[PDB]
Amino acid sequence: LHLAFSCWLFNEDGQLLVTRRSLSKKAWPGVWTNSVCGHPQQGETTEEAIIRRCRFELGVEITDLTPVYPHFSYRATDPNGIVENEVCPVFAARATSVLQVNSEEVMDYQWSEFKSVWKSLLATPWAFSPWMVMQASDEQARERLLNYCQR
Numbered sequence: 001l002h003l004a005f006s007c008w009l010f011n012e013d014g015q016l017l018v019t020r021r022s023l024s025k026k027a028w029p030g031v032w033t034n035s036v037c038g039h040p041q042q043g044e045t046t047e048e049a050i051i052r053r054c055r056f057e058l059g060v061e062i063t064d065l066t067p068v069y070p071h072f073s074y075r076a077t078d079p080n081g082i083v084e085n086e087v088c089p090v091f092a093a094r095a096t097s098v099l100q101v102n103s104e105e106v107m108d109y110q111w112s113e114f115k116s117v118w119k120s121l122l123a124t125p126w127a128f129s130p131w132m133v134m135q136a137s138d139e140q141a142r143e144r145l146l147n148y149c150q151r
Helices: 046-058 114-123 130-136 139-146
Strands: 005-010 016-021 036-038 062-069 073-077 083-087 090-095 106-112
Touching: 005 046, 005 062, 005 130, 016 046, 016 114, 036 046, 046 062, 046 090, 046 106, 062 139, 090 139, 106 114, 114 130, 114 139, 130 139
Parallel strands: 005 090
Antiparallel strands: 005 016, 005 036, 016 106, 062 090, 073 083
């Protein structure tokens, strides 16, 4: 389909859930990244897919799903220049239940102040997933994320 999505999940204290992909992920194992990313399955809405993957990867319920970067596209090229292009709209959401993280999906995670995370994405972007860096680097999306919890 070439359809993907990304989710930045916040708690009631306004902290962002930064996750570390498990070592068993085929793609980007062991990398620190925004809360959840994924792809919708057959005849599933983007929203539905986000809810499904938050529940499966993080064991969590969410609310207030809000678009923060609808035009984001993720372009990846391999060492031979084979290109993969996919739309990847970005959303923010609020956690409404305690985490029950699936260790096959996520090996570590931290609730962190978004301002602090951005400091590191600027200083050492290579320590995080490339889509996390590219999503937060858009000024409008970053403003939306910084202000999401305060509405």
